[PDB]
Amino acid sequence: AADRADILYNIRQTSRPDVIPTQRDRPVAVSVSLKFINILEVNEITNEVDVVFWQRTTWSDRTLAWDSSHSPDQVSVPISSLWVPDLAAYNAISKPEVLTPQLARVVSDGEVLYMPSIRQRFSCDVSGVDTESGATCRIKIGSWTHHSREISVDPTTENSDDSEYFSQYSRFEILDVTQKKNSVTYSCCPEAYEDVEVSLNFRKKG
Amino acid sequence: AADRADILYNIRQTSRPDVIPTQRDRPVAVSVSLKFINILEVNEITNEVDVVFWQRTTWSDRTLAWDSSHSPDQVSVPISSLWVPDLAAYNAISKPEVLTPQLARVVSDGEVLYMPSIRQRFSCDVSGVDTESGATCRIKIGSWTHHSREISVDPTTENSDDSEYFSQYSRFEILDVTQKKNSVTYSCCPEAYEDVEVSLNFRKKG
Amino acid sequence: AADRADILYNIRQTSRPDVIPTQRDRPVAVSVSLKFINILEVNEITNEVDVVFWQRTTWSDRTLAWDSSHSPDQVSVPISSLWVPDLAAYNAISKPEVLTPQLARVVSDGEVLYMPSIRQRFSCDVSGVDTESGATCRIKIGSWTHHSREISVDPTTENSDDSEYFSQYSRFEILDVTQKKNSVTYSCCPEAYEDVEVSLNFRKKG
Amino acid sequence: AADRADILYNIRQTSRPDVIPTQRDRPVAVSVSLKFINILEVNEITNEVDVVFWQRTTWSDRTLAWDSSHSPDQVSVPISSLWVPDLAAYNAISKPEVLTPQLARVVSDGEVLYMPSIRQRFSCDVSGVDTESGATCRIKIGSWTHHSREISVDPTTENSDDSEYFSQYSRFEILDVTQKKNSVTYSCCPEAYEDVEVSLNFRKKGR
Amino acid sequence: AADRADILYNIRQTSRPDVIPTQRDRPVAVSVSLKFINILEVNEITNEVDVVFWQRTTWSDRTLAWDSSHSPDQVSVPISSLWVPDLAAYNAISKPEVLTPQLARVVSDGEVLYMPSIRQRFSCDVSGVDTESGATCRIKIGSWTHHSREISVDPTTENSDDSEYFSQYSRFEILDVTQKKNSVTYSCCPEAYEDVEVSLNFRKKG
Ligand SMILES: N=C1NCCN1Cc1ccc(Cl)nc1
Ligand SMILES: N=C1NCCN1Cc1ccc(Cl)nc1
Ligand SMILES: N=C1NCCN1Cc1ccc(Cl)nc1
């Protein structure tokens, strides 16, 4: 019957932040889905935008699992104590600005959830943001160094209200958001890398 | 018959900065109260504002208690040596800029007070800022990863003037500040999360 | 017979950065003095100014003391290895940008001197900066978490022109500088906190 | 039998981040090539540009090798656990802003690949950015403190599409990219320092 | 029988980053000379300029020496493993932005060379920048906490074209560069602190 202190202590002794938790020779299945919170500074002339979004990220890591028969079955853990997938947005033109406490939730079964609220600038198509149809800014996110056999990424099944969390005070409104998985091979490299492309159709209010 | 050195040393020997100090299976009660110091940048067109405030924060941690019968009963402690609630402002569009030494005040019975002065940018209703009625900007703050059964937040009904510490050189002025407590279940997640909503009614001086 | 290496090693092992060096039941006496170096960007519309100054800060930590009858008398020491008063500028609207190496000077008797050059933005009265009488910007600095019985702050003065180190290439000039001492009691807390208030009377150069 | 945990621990135990892995008495051969992702800011008046690019960097460190017969032959390693060349862009006017996770790939034979995506501002020729032949911005990269007898740098034959990774949404477009090596002796210092000069020929597009 | 790993190993044992390496009771002789790379943001209205420059800095530290009879006689070392003089630019209005890897070069005889390329903004005389005689910007650099008896700073009057490294794409050009050594006694303190003043004569092109 251990408490949270013991659950945290066993996580640091067994957890290897630098070691991807693959099972045998299977890829670590990572789920990525964005929940837009705000659109702050659009520029149609430069095709750049400033977005704020929650980056819901989940994966399994057995090396963390613990017996919660008679103890807390879930805890908040600092990401520096866990292996976290090395995701990056291909068309982001600034480092992600993590606005929230960098803590993830870890379940006794090893399921991990990490959902930081991020503000980041992207290079995308802003043409038409000032029309009825609007603009569609696509954002691609995938593992930076782990190819398809080590990390697989797919859009979460969840499909909440596109703007269920979006700021009603933004100068913009979300028309629609679609997610689409991809598996690409680049000439630079022999292996294929997976990514999830999120298409944000939005327009200036009026 | 200890001194401040021993008090600090002991705290390092029992404090678990990454372990939420829950008593029994009950939530840690955190009190949040904002004292506005300044309103630096307001943009009605973008509905964005820059505010400086003291975030009076209190909670209890019995793992820090000590016998002060023959020693001081209070000491300043760097927050990095203590567990601190993972609070985040939901509508913040910038990371908080802590303008003061990051030290908390710990009392012998375990009571902790951390009151950092913060400059942060928010996304809120700025409409009417130039009218006599002014604008009403709501700031939502709560635990980012600890649900209602782990952390509960409540407003500090402290009796004092809202503009008691507000700068007299700001281009704006405070008309009224109210603080209400909320509890919300989001579609993203199973448990409920609490937050304190602080409503700042202010306007440009005449 | 000891060298600097011995002295600096001893200082690191005995000095406790998180323990205020109070002696007996009396407060640590801290002296503070500002020597203005520049005025970079003033804004009368927003009552905001950007200043560069040397903050001469001194205090005692007798535990650091050592017999220098047969070894160095003084040594430069990184402030992170020393306890330093948690001073804060109450009306500052940006964090201090320390321009100089963060080293303090420790004399064998335990006297500590720290004089960083700092650029910082403040919210103060800028009205009249374009007039012959100029504006008077007041800066308030004092311990953030240590009350009057743990830390004391007092203004230091030098028999030297207020503009002796001021930039001749600045668009502004110094008319006068005065420093008063205060002991304010805030409704937030029971004890009183001291502060040094420095008044800067400056104006745009003809 | 070895797993990733064994390898990463061994790498971190044998790798010397502050010791250039020169073999015998030859210099470490570092390969550098840039893959342009975007051109964000251009000022023909000041001759300053803001670019985003993948700085592909490869070199060998034999001590990192391990028998991959019964184990993985490739792993991602944080660069803080490895010695990496102290490359610097001579004409850069801002610290490089690394946009991606700072991880390198280490192969069982000791081959290392580090390819960060970087946004950085440079001082180069921007004249003609609105012409048909565009401007040609030269970026010079080489080791900051290791001379030619310690580190050598060569351009990788990027015989691929120059705009393969370039953003289709940039206000600019790439016409051509060439790379050439140089070995320079400055009057400041007795030894020669090698570098790779990347020539970016680009221009503003038309409506 | 020794290699680079051995050399670095010995250095990170005998070397004390916090201890100035004085010989006997004499001061550490430090050579400082700036190689201008670019002039970027000139403002004649505010007497401010953004300059990029290699800050060649040399000095000796015998505690680093080693027998190079059968081993390399030079190695690149992170400055965090070495004592480095605490130089500061008096009229700089921003912290130094070090653009290059922070490595110093150490020779077997204990000679050290540290030459980072720095971008920094200064407050200096910009008047005349648009004339033929041009503006003359004076930059002052010296130890911050080490007085004449601990550190002396002298310029390296080497015949190196003032524009060898200067960017041919700058909007400005270097007419001439001169150096001058000084020794000052600031009202704040008894000792005298040496500095080198580098006068930069430049002008707009054409
Ligand atoms: N994520 C991708 N897809 C193609 C290239 N790349 C980036 C990448 C791959 C491997 C290393 Cl060590 N560094 C960066
Ligand atoms: N504080 C809240 N309320 C709804 C979502 N959320 C943020 C959150 C919750 C759990 C984790 Cl691991 N990360 C971020
Ligand atoms: N010194 C000041 N200024 C405003 C309030 N206060 C006192 C204070 C007391 C305790 C803690 Cl943790 N922080 C600040």
Ligand SMILES: N=C1NCCN1Cc1ccc(Cl)nc1
């Ligand atoms: N890469 C080059 N070429 C000439 C000068 N230089 C930079 C350099 C060389 C040595 C040290 Cl310790 N610091 C900086």
Ligand SMILES: N=C1NCCN1Cc1ccc(Cl)nc1
């Ligand atoms: N070099 C300078 N410039 C202004 C004052 N000073 C000398 C000095 C002496 C002691 C300490 Cl702790 N700091 C600085």
